[PDB]
Design a protein around this ligand. Structure first.
Ligand SMILES: O=C(CO)[C@@H](O)[C@H](O)[C@H](O)COP(=O)(O)O
Ligand SMILES: O=C(CO)[C@@H](O)[C@H](O)[C@H](O)COP(=O)(O)O
Lengths: 608, 608
């Protein structure tokens, strides 16, 4: 979800709306804002649907005033409803929050029994009634919030307002991000600096436990207790472009086309003279990485798929045992820890709840250390890991990851090179990987010029409701990732298989209507994969084969061959992802689906 | 595929047909037979389709004579065609074969260049033209076959006939099973004794390299060279019932209902006084199993799914690191071998080509040892493993495994108990597992009495083309197995997910038409799973929850709760499989699909 707050001299409603538009990719099931004018007349508006529903409403009933808070949300529990939309109130108290109040249930009973009525089942109302109760003796809002916060347990961020005293906002960071934007004679707050770029580039990042008292002219941050702490303001490092689509129709589209440049940025400072350079990790990292006998990778969704590709690399190239597991399963099992095991999390956001819970469990279980591969500076996974290797792909706004996945593989391959060197293996392994990486942005630039043939193919998917994706070896998780892209944004029921598994049952699914998408680099598995493709064609499947130009496939009625330029084997999985990203994009366009904000979802699963 | 041969005084055509009916589950894309009368007039008949197509043809054109061979086949390459149906000929030579002639291609060119014409691309014709060439100087058929066999490389079984001399059949076992049935004044051969039960129970199992010269009155087996070897005939140990359906409409149905009795048979001799007893493994097995620090399980399809369940058991109960991998991916990767690693294959048939290739690779890679868990005495995996633990489930004929899967889990759980004892862990782990196992046939008998409610539910799937299955923890591979059953035999596009993965993309698939099947034991993951189910319901999914009676689910419009009796947690995955087997069965009935012989498949993938 996304939180924006604002305390200014000028009206803030437009600012709060522009803030929600920018955080929309985090939840687009509902949104609301509440604005108090200097006279304390508070106007609250809440709508079901995308932020535009709220903006439209606001245009009919405009909201005057300098103080306000706003929210946009991914509704998990129950069908989304306007009754549950934020902000929530308790008379004069008004509240928005992100994250979770773990002890929702006892606090609720206790407030009920003190005489409160609950209009919703949200945690937000719990926080509202509680602060109302804390104020009932008559102190300052800050005083009540200091009393209130210790009674709340869980991982959450909240902004709180007393409409009787529109001069001050209170915010409390306790598990979920909050950041204050510093203006001139006005201040703002948000769950992500991205929402505040249009009015300020100067930010104070609250640390866990911080409570902030914010007026037009002052920012006072206090610790756990009531003691003031010092927090440095800094200049934004995000791009000025941020959540602008530029010439692109979709964020996803932009992010697919940005991949050559994002990859270059992932590589900056990290390749030198035919070798990989990960000295940014510092003068104790080699000692650690040198002791690694086993790698455990933990991730969700597309970040799990890149870990699955790298497993083939780590075992075959660095000779290191590597397991990859989805984090929602790992975090609850009673696992057997390998000797000398490195925990690697992959996460674009660095905030995914299950991945984060895996990392926290791993400390307790005695792994050797942990390495974060992350796209977000200063996210939870980065600060709680022993080591971090940032992807440098830039902000990613498309709910479906494209550039995050391919820059993750780039970094994995670097770490494969580094480990192969620390183990004293053939120097050629590192050389060949570095040759790969060095060609990679140009190879991707070159694959993107196949976009028009893929766009033409996508029209065939117009009447389709199913698809199968097939790959073998290190291309098998590339099939997984293409099937996930396709089903997530076009809603075709796409399913991936390692090609060797069909004759054990799934081949029953093939009839004359089933399209089957395959990635076919010209490598030692080509003949084995060709056999699989023939098994599919023999039962009437419609084949779409992205194959190397010299693979020798013969095009026909049910065999559509999209010829691919040559590529270094070591980077072949990254290259073959690109056509599947384009195909998913184009099919979604044909289907008329919301490519950037697919239904039932939002980006980054930060609450379990 | 399935091979039958016969050399008798009486007509053999009916016998050869009855033989193919019994081997049909091995391939039902085409079949053929060739029969020579005492005058050497040879009649060959071949039909596309199930064996009944051939039998019907035979009823129109009956085939007299005492000598013949027959085949039924799973067509892999190309659309099945009558031109490719076996037997194949080269004038007077007639041949059927199973397996693969790896050097098909050079032998073919060489025969072409000697003047042969090829009517098909089958390996069978290669063998036929080659034996024709070997006879062209004029020796005995046996002589030519001894010259021919060394020129063939690969894993295959073949029976060969010269219609000019109907007095003798030649067969050669070189990688694929052959067995001779001994009659009285007549002999038979088949690729599996199951085909010969109706005329004999006395068998000679050929060993690899064996060449057999078979007449009405004699069986001479020769080794690699021309030297005679001794092979003992034995009495069949299969059940008299074998490939009879009895009162059951389908083999699959029978095999589902047999599970309590099959499980009892898996347990016989192996539980004693609250402890597991695996002393059948012998007086060097404990030494081995005692050194195990890591377990690698290799299997395909449903046998991979049982390995995935046991991974949760091995790590959480015996504290042993366990990886599970599909064998088609394992056999071609350059893997990193763990120290002290036990290779475990799971296979009903004991002959699955990829699983077998994994086991063979593991010898070469230096694992500690290998353990086969198999349903077939004397199959390849059993004889090439260091240790074997048979499931004792009895012959399984349904192309889709039911009893094989559940008896595999039973044996896995026993081995978990044994390892937990060898490691000196809490004695209660073994006790609780043995309490589980001891209740298990009755718990299964009790689940089978829920069949009528499941049959009623299945009618809802009549208009459905998709389904999702959800599970967490050790029930997650139970969802995988239920989705595989459903898609294999009903052709609904069923897909399994660990419940925690939906919000990372797959939840986009949920609309008002999607049925979602969930297994919900009353265990520590119930509340976490309930959250997932609510996420699905909130977007309009149709929930089918097989839940413990005390799980507290509330039934409604899109929430169908099938209440399950209580069960011991340790056996909960085995118990919750049963309702998904029944549901798949009943949905297939509603859809009017061939439950026992699903399209595009056959049972056991014995050629890659
Ligand atoms: O982007 C997608 C789908 O295309 C998601 O599957 C994620 O990859 C995921 O939810 C993990 O998120 P991060 O941990 O990478 O932030
Ligand atoms: O029965 C099924 C499908 O329900 C197959 O997926 C197999 O389990 C498989 O082909 C492995 O065969 P076996 O190795 O167990 O003989």
């Amino acid at each position: 979800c996304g939180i924006v707050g604002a305390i200014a001299q000028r009206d803030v409603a437009e600012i709060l709306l522009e803030g929600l538009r920018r955080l929309e990719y985090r939840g687009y099931d509902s949104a609301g804002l509440a604005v108090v004018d200097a006279e304390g007349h508070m106007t609250r508006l809440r709508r079901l649907g995308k932020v535009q529903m709220l903006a439209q409403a606001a245009e009919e009933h405009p909201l005057h005033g300098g103080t306000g808070i706003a929210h946009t949300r991914w509704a998990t529990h129950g069908e989304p409803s306007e009754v549950n939309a934020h902000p929530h109130v308790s008379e004069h108290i008004v509240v928005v929050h992100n994250g979770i109040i773990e002890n929702h249930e006892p606090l609720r009973e206790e407030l009920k029994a003190r005489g409160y009525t609950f209009v919703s089942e949200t945690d937000t109302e719990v926080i509202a009634h509680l602060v109302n109760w804390e104020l009932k003796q008559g102190g300052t809002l800050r005083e009540a919030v200091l009393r209130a916060i210790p009674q709340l347990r869980g991982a959450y961020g909240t902004v709180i307002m007393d409409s009787r005293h529109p001069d001050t906002l209170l915010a409390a960071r306790s598990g979920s991000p909050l950041v204050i934007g510093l203006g001139m004679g006005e201040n703002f707050i948000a769950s992500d600096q991205l929402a505040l770029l249009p009015v300020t580039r100067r930010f104070i990042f609250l640390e866990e436990g911080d409570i902030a008292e914010i007026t037009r002219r002052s920012v006072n941050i206090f610790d756990k207790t009531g003691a003031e702490v010092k927090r440095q303001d800094i200049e934004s490092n995000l791009q000025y472009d941020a959540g602008d689509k530029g010439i692109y129709r979709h964020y996803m589209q932009k992010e697919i086309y940005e991949q050559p440049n994002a990859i270059k940025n992932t590589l900056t400072g990290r390749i030198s003279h035919g070798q990989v350079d990960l000295s940014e990790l510092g003068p104790n990292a080699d000692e650690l990485l040198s002791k690694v006998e086993h790698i455990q990778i933990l991730a969700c969704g597309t970040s799990y798929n890149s870990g699955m590709v790298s497993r083939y690399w780590f075992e075959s190239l660095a000779g290191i045992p590597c397991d990859v597991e989805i984090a929602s399963e790992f975090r609850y099992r009673k696992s057997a820890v390998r000797r000398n095991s490195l925990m690697i999390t992959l996460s674009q956001s660095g905030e995914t709840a299950d991945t984060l819970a895996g990392l926290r469990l791993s400390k307790e279980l005695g792994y050797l250390g942990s390495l974060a591969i992350c796209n977000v500076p200063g996210s939870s996974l980065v600060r709680e890991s022993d080591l971090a290797l940032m992807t440098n792909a830039g902000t990613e706004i498309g709910v479906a990851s494209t550039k995050a996945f391919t820059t993750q593989l780039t970094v994995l391959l670097m770490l494969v090179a580094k480990l192969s060197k620390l183990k004293g293996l053939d120097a050629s392994i590192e050389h060949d990987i570095v040759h790969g990486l060095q060609a990679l942005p140009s190879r991707i630039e070159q694959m993107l010029s196949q976009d028009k043939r893929i766009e033409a193919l996508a029209e065939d998917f117009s009447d389709k409701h199913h698809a199968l994706f097939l790959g073998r070896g290190d291309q098998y998780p590339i099939a997984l990732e293409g099937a996930l892209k396709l089903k997530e944004i076009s809603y075709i029921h796409a399913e991936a298989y390692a090609a060797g598994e069909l004759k054990h049952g799934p081949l029953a699914l093939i009839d004359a209507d089933m399209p089957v998408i395959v990635v076919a680099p010209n490598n030692e598995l080509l003949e084995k994969l060709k056999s699989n493709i023939e098994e599919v064609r023999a039962r009437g499947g419609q084949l779409y084969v992205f194959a190397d130009q010299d693979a020798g496939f013969v095009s026909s009625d049910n065999m559509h061959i999209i010829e691919m330029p040559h590529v270094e084997e070591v980077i072949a999985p990254i290259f073959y992802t690109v056509p599947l990203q384009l195909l998913a994009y184009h099919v979604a366009l044909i289907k008329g689906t919301d490519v950037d904000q697919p239904r039932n979802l939002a980006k980054s699963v930060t609450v379990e």
